[PDB]
């Protein structure tokens, strides 16, 4: 029976491949060739944030485009005021091996975790004025690689056990498990309407998940190695991924096909992080060469670079409004560009 | 009237920065160690004789050591291995001797040593269960490592009294198998410190201490162009 089920799976895979070929009338590169290029982009560092001692693994912008949360390997989270560069909080962690963090859209909570397989949720707004742990979420058996906030009572996490999960923060119980990956899950991204999310994994694939049903709606392939970063397009009908093969790819959720490849002969390093600008025209990615390249998302041309790091770039993000891009690296510094 | 809020933020930084400075003193004076080993490795005895991650703290001669043991993580090491790229040392425990467990350990050592992010991290290597190797050999290596048939005891070998020369050859053969990898790939940035220990031995606590010292000393000697 096993050989026949395998043959059936191969037949379905071939049917899917032909179904996708049937829609491949033209590539993106044959349409946007009539669009003027963005030209040279020269961003400059405006502010530098100092205080972490260990390599910084995660950074996330809040919804007011004014506060940042960052996490280093020391066992600390720092809340920063990007405008005045002043610190707001410095939260000690139970363990130093923190790999991800997230800022709640309400500004009330901060989530983080990593090798302890526990997602810790801190309440930043308490009557005593002291930051306290409000919840510890546990169930995941592998390391925690990414956390995202849907609402104050709902959080989406991913772990190294190939399973994503939706947690009910107030009750502390896991409510939805998303399975089907075979490698570690590296990065999550939520849809603008937070009904769908996409999960990239160390399988050279990504999956489009239905937040409400618990069903995996689409599976995307195309990368040659492990996927390290994923980011939804501003419109919500496409996402960009980065992998260890030194290529970045844009996928279309409505055509279930790869749409564009971003690569260069001189780039042989993986892509630690991927992010889009407010208009979706610029794609930014951090590399292992201690820099960041800004790509024209509609042309696959390089628009410019962000150089100012001496160690691996670990994270990148853009403000909701779009006024600034912030990055972090293993140098224990955060920088803001303009 | 907005100056009152700005003043308040300055006060917060003063409180935070002073605390960060205190923490910095604690951070730099603490020596972090990563503990890895074979599935049959006596890691529980490595810890006893000294979730997803466990922490053990030691104070050895007024020096604070922090050892992290990998808990219930997936067998795929290539992603969390990068995180431990700034520890003082990696302690790798391999049991000598059903698959060819030693070849698996050599393959893991190789991959860890040649990792682009671990090029500056030294490895302290413990070879455990010496009595099982000794009994197996005196009671086979050539069926797994044919070159052992032509191996001779190093001229600088210092075996304990009472050891069977066949056992001493097996121990040095295995040690040399690890050392050839370390020597061939190393470029003076990090070193391997192999040791031959017993399943139960409290002396291991000083072996790590002394090795950590030498690692740091040679690091500084490299910096001062003396070594």
């Amino acid at each position: 029976e096993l050989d026949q089920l395998r043959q059936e799976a191969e037949q379905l895979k071939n049917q899917i491949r032909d179904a996708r070929k049937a829609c491949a009338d033209a590539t993106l590169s044959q349409i946007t060739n009539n669009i003027d290029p963005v030209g040279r982009i020269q961003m400059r560092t405006r502010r530098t944030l100092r205080g972490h001692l260990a390599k910084i693994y995660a950074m996330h912008w809040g919804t007011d485009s004014r506060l940042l949360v960052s996490a280093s390997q020391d066992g600390k989270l720092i809340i920063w005021d990007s405008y005045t560069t002043n610190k707001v909080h410095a939260i000690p962690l139970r363990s130093s091996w923190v790999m991800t963090c997230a800022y709640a859209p309400s500004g009330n909570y901060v989530a983080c975790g990593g090798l302890d397989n526990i997602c810790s949720i801190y309440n930043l707004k308490t009557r005593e004025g002291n930051v306290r742990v409000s919840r510890e979420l546990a169930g995941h058996t592998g390391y925690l690689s990414c956390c995202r906030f849907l609402d104050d009572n709902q959080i989406v996490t991913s772990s190294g056990d190939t399973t994503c999960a939706l947690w009910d923060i107030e009750t502390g119980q896991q409510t939805t498990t998303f399975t089907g990956h075979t490698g570690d899950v590296m990065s999550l991204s939520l849809a603008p309407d937070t009904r769908l999310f996409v999960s990239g994994a160390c399988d050279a694939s990504a999956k489009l998940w239905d937040v409400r049903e618990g069903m995996c709606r689409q599976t995307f392939t195309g990368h040659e190695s492990d996927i390290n970063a994923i980011c939804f397009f501003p419109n919500g009908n496409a996402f960009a991924t980065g992998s260890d093969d030194a290529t970045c790819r844009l996928f279309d959720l409505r055509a279930d096909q790869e749409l564009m490849t971003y690569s260069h002969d001189n780039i042989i390093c993986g892509i630690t992080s991927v992010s889009f600008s407010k208009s979706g025209r610029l794609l930014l990615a951090g590399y292992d060469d201690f820099n960041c390249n800004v790509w024209d998302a509609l042309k696959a041309d390089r628009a410019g670079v962000l150089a100012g790091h001496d160690n691996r770039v670990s994270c990148l993000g853009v403000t909701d409004d779009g006024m600034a891009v912030a990055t972090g690296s293993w140098d224990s510094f955060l920088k803001i560009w303009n | 009237d907005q100056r009152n809020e700005e003043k308040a933020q300055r006060e917060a930084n003063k409180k935070i920065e002073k605390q960060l400075q205190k923490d910095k003193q604690v951070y730099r004076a603490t020596h972090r160690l990563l503990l890895l080993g074979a599935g049959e490795s006596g890691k529980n005895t490595i810890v006893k004789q000294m979730s997803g991650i466990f922490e053990t703290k030691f104070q050895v001669d007024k020096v604070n050591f922090h050892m992290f043991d990998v808990g219930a993580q997936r067998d795929e090491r290539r992603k969390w291995i990068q995180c431990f790229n700034d520890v003082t040392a990696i302690i790798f425990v391999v049991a000598s001797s059903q698959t060819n467990r030693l070849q698996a350990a050599l393959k893991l050592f190789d991959s860890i040593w040649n990792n682009k992010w671990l090029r500056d991290t030294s490895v302290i290597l413990f070879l455990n269960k010496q009595d099982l190797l000794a009994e197996k050999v005196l009671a086979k290596i050539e069926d797994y490592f044919p070159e052992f048939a032509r191996y001779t005891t190093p001229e600088d070998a210092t075996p304990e009294p009472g050891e069977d020369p066949r056992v001493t050859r097996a121990k040095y053969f295995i040690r040399d198998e690890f050392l050839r990898i370390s020597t061939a790939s190393g470029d003076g940035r990090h070193y391997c410190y192999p040791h031959f220990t017993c399943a139960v031995d409290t002396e291991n606590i000083r072996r790590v201490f002394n090795d950590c010292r030498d690692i740091i000393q040679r690091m500084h000697l490299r910096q001062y162009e003396l070594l």
Partner: nanobody
Framework: QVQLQESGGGLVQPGGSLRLSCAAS????????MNWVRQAPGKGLEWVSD????????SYTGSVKGRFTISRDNAKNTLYLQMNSLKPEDTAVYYC?????????????????????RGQGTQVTV
């Protein structure tokens, strides 16, 4: 999507030989190190052979030295294995595996848990 499909298996008498193959797709073959691993009927996966991207450096487990050889052809994306002077001890399912990242020399591909870049394997009964 990347695939590895083994071939050239079968049953042979002691002292005989086989030539195994492995077809790869979905990735640039010449940028990755390739390995052969075996699954023993009653034992966990064991590494057998490791060939570098260029074919310049080939490593074998001690138990197969002088009996097994490997090669690769980067113009065909094909990995082979010559299995000579076989004994009952060599009965196993053989798999052709790929190192997880290009342009590197560190590999973790004999994991008990489902490995993403491993083929289905071919049974070599002797």
């Amino acid at each position: 999507q990347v695939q590895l499909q083994e071939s050239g298996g079968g049953l042979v008498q002691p002292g005989g030989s086989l030539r195994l193959s492995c077809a790869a797709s979905g990735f640039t073959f010449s940028n990755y190190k390739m390995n052969w691993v075996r699954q023993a009927p009653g034992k966990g996966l064991e590494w057998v052979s490791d060939i570098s991207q260029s074919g310049a450096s080939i490593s074998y487990t001690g138990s197969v030295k002088g009996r097994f050889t490997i090669s690769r052809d980067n113009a065909k994306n094909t990995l082979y294995l010559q299995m000579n002077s076989l004994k009952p001890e060599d009965t196993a399912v053989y798999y052709c595996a790929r190192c997880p990242a290009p342009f590197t020399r560190d590999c973790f591909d004999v994991t008990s848990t489902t490995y993403a870049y491993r083929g289905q394997g071919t049974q070599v009964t002797v």
